Design a protein around this motif. Structure first.
Motif, mmCIF file in Angstrom:
data_model
loop_
_atom_site.group_PDB
_atom_site.id
_atom_site.type_symbol
_atom_site.label_atom_id
_atom_site.label_comp_id
_atom_site.label_asym_id
_atom_site.label_seq_id
_atom_site.Cartn_x
_atom_site.Cartn_y
_atom_site.Cartn_z
ATOM 1 N N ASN A 105 29.573 48.529 36.424
ATOM 2 C CA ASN A 105 30.386 48.227 35.249
ATOM 3 C C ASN A 105 31.158 46.924 35.452
ATOM 4 O O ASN A 105 32.378 46.863 35.296
ATOM 5 C CB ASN A 105 31.335 49.384 34.928
ATOM 6 N N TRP A 106 30.424 45.870 35.813
ATOM 7 C CA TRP A 106 31.044 44.573 36.053
ATOM 8 C C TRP A 106 31.759 44.039 34.820
ATOM 9 O O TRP A 106 32.642 43.185 34.950
ATOM 10 C CB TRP A 106 29.993 43.561 36.514
ATOM 11 N N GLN A 107 31.401 44.520 33.628
ATOM 12 C CA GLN A 107 32.039 44.034 32.410
ATOM 13 C C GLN A 107 33.530 44.339 32.380
ATOM 14 O O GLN A 107 34.269 43.680 31.640
ATOM 15 C CB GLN A 107 31.369 44.647 31.178
ATOM 16 N N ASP A 108 33.989 45.314 33.162
ATOM 17 C CA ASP A 108 35.380 45.740 33.153
ATOM 18 C C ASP A 108 36.186 45.159 34.306
ATOM 19 O O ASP A 108 37.324 45.582 34.526
ATOM 20 C CB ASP A 108 35.457 47.267 33.186
ATOM 21 N N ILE A 109 35.628 44.205 35.048
ATOM 22 C CA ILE A 109 36.360 43.592 36.150
ATOM 23 C C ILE A 109 37.562 42.851 35.584
ATOM 24 O O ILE A 109 37.415 41.870 34.846
ATOM 25 C CB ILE A 109 35.453 42.655 36.958
ATOM 26 N N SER A 110 38.760 43.319 35.926
ATOM 27 C CA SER A 110 39.975 42.713 35.405
ATOM 28 C C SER A 110 40.156 41.314 35.976
ATOM 29 O O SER A 110 40.020 41.102 37.184
ATOM 30 C CB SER A 110 41.185 43.582 35.744
ATOM 31 N N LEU A 111 40.453 40.358 35.102
ATOM 32 C CA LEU A 111 40.733 38.983 35.513
ATOM 33 C C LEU A 111 42.234 38.748 35.673
ATOM 34 O O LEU A 111 42.803 37.812 35.113
ATOM 35 C CB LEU A 111 40.129 38.015 34.503
ATOM 36 N N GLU A 112 42.894 39.609 36.449
ATOM 37 C CA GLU A 112 44.328 39.465 36.665
ATOM 38 C C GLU A 112 44.657 38.463 37.762
ATOM 39 O O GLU A 112 45.778 37.943 37.790
ATOM 40 C CB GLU A 112 44.955 40.827 36.993
ATOM 41 N N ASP A 113 43.718 38.184 38.663
ATOM 42 C CA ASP A 113 43.953 37.226 39.734
ATOM 43 C C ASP A 113 43.682 35.818 39.217
ATOM 44 O O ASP A 113 42.594 35.536 38.703
ATOM 45 C CB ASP A 113 43.070 37.538 40.938
ATOM 46 N N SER A 114 44.674 34.937 39.355
ATOM 47 C CA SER A 114 44.528 33.579 38.844
ATOM 48 C C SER A 114 43.398 32.842 39.548
ATOM 49 O O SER A 114 42.638 32.106 38.910
ATOM 50 C CB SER A 114 45.844 32.817 39.001
ATOM 51 N N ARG A 115 43.274 33.017 40.864
ATOM 52 C CA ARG A 115 42.215 32.338 41.605
ATOM 53 C C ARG A 115 40.842 32.698 41.048
ATOM 54 O O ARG A 115 40.038 31.815 40.721
ATOM 55 C CB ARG A 115 42.306 32.708 43.087
ATOM 56 N N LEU A 116 40.559 33.996 40.931
ATOM 57 C CA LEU A 116 39.246 34.430 40.468
ATOM 58 C C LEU A 116 39.026 34.059 39.008
ATOM 59 O O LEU A 116 37.921 33.653 38.623
ATOM 60 C CB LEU A 116 39.098 35.937 40.674
ATOM 61 N N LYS A 117 40.062 34.196 38.179
ATOM 62 C CA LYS A 117 39.943 33.802 36.781
ATOM 63 C C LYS A 117 39.576 32.330 36.666
ATOM 64 O O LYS A 117 38.660 31.959 35.921
ATOM 65 C CB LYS A 117 41.255 34.087 36.048
ATOM 66 N N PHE A 118 40.281 31.473 37.408
ATOM 67 C CA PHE A 118 39.993 30.047 37.369
ATOM 68 C C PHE A 118 38.582 29.768 37.858
ATOM 69 O O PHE A 118 37.848 28.989 37.246
ATOM 70 C CB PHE A 118 41.009 29.280 38.214
ATOM 71 N N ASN A 119 38.181 30.396 38.965
ATOM 72 C CA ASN A 119 36.843 30.152 39.488
ATOM 73 C C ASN A 119 35.784 30.497 38.449
ATOM 74 O O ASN A 119 34.916 29.674 38.129
ATOM 75 C CB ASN A 119 36.626 30.962 40.766
ATOM 76 N N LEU A 120 35.858 31.707 37.892
ATOM 77 C CA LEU A 120 34.843 32.141 36.938
ATOM 78 C C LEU A 120 34.837 31.252 35.701
ATOM 79 O O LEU A 120 33.775 30.801 35.252
ATOM 80 C CB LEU A 120 35.081 33.600 36.550
ATOM 81 N N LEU A 121 36.015 30.991 35.129
ATOM 82 C CA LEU A 121 36.064 30.231 33.886
ATOM 83 C C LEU A 121 35.628 28.789 34.100
ATOM 84 O O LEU A 121 34.933 28.218 33.255
ATOM 85 C CB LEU A 121 37.470 30.291 33.291
ATOM 86 N N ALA A 122 36.023 28.178 35.219
ATOM 87 C CA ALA A 122 35.596 26.815 35.504
ATOM 88 C C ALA A 122 34.091 26.745 35.705
ATOM 89 O O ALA A 122 33.436 25.821 35.209
ATOM 90 C CB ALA A 122 36.329 26.285 36.735
ATOM 91 N N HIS A 123 33.520 27.709 36.429
ATOM 92 C CA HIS A 123 32.072 27.723 36.608
ATOM 93 C C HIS A 123 31.366 27.856 35.265
ATOM 94 O O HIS A 123 30.400 27.136 34.981
ATOM 95 C CB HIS A 123 31.671 28.863 37.543
ATOM 96 N N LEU A 124 31.845 28.771 34.419
ATOM 97 C CA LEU A 124 31.220 28.963 33.115
ATOM 98 C C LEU A 124 31.330 27.709 32.260
ATOM 99 O O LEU A 124 30.367 27.320 31.591
ATOM 100 C CB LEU A 124 31.860 30.152 32.401
ATOM 101 N N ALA A 125 32.500 27.069 32.260
ATOM 102 C CA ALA A 125 32.677 25.857 31.471
ATOM 103 C C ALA A 125 31.759 24.748 31.961
ATOM 104 O O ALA A 125 31.112 24.067 31.158
ATOM 105 C CB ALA A 125 34.136 25.405 31.523
ATOM 106 N N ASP A 126 31.672 24.562 33.279
ATOM 107 C CA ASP A 126 30.797 23.527 33.815
ATOM 108 C C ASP A 126 29.344 23.802 33.457
ATOM 109 O O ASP A 126 28.597 22.879 33.111
ATOM 110 C CB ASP A 126 30.967 23.433 35.331
ATOM 111 N N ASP A 127 28.922 25.065 33.532
ATOM 112 C CA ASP A 127 27.524 25.388 33.270
ATOM 113 C C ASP A 127 27.180 25.233 31.793
ATOM 114 O O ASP A 127 26.160 24.627 31.445
ATOM 115 C CB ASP A 127 27.223 26.810 33.745
#
Lengths: 148, 105
Positions: free
Chosen positions: B32-54
């Motif tokens: 259920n990866w869809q429910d992974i909470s993005l409460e950590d700023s580090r992980l949120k930034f990593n995921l969102l930056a990767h998605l934006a770059d891609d």
């Protein structure tokens, strides 16, 4: 006032209803603006209503020109050559829609006082009254006091 | 040298879920990866930056706070956006033959 205004008689452009009804409106030119609060309603009308109106009235050519304008306008040109210019300045979408529909349903004849609420080309079927109607005829056409 | 202005149009990729889950595995894996909470700023930034770059499309600051879960990120990245001018939109909205639209701009 009537005395200070021209007047006409009720009439149709070409006996519009006898053979077939013909929509007298033929052209609608909407001068609108990309920017300017005055033409916000005109912009919304162009977005949401002008296409539906155009397909409802296939006999009317609609020219939407978006150019810098302080007073957005609608120019209605009718078959008889009449041109009526209206301001859609600071008018809502509903107001613009009603105005456009009124222009579509309206003929090109001048909006002035109409002398009579009716117009008959054949007012009489039994013969227009003249003084000799309802007057009996006399023998040998003798006028009163004639001796012979 | 200023790079050419980027077009704001963005059509979601067909393999959006697969790409997103690959990026999720790269960043963070559990069911259920869809429910992974993005409460950590580090992980949120990593995921969102990767998605934006891609994908060439980045989450605006206004929606950045409400992107709380991978499901929210997926919703934002699957809703499309178009940047065509109003003239193009009106002309491509199947104008009837009796309706002519022109700009003097």
């Amino acid at each position: 006032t009537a005395r200070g205004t021209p007047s006409r008689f009720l009439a149709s452009v070409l006996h519009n209803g006898l053979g077939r009804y013909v929509q007298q409106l033929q052209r609608l030119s909407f001068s609108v603006s990309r920017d300017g609060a005055s033409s916000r309603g005109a912009r919304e009308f162009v977005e949401r209503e002008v296409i539906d109106f155009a397909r409802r009235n296939p006999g009317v050519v609609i020219y939407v020109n978006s150019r810098p304008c302080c007073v957005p306008r609608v120019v209605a040109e009718y078959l008889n050559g009449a041109v009526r210019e209206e301001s859609i300045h600071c008018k809502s979408v509903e107001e613009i829609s009603t105005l456009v529909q009124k222009l579509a349903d309206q003929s090109g004849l001048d909006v002035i006082r109409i002398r009579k609420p009716f117009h008959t080309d054949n007012p009489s079927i039994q013969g227009q009254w003249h003084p000799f109607t309802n007057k009996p005829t006399t023998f040998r056409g003798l006028r009163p006091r004639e001796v012979q | 040298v200023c790079p050419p202005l980027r077009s704001r149009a963005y059509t979601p990729p067909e393999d959006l879920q697969s790409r997103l889950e690959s990026y999720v595995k790269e960043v963070f894996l559990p069911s259920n990866w869809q429910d992974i909470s993005l409460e950590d700023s580090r992980l949120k930034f990593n995921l969102l930056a990767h998605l934006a770059d891609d994908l060439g499309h980045v989450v605006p600051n206004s929606r950045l706070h409400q992107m709380c879960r991978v499901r929210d990120v997926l919703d934002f990245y699957n809703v499309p956006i178009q940047d065509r001018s109003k003239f193009d939109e009106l002309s491509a909205s199947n104008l009837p033959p009796n309706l002519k639209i022109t700009w003097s701009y």
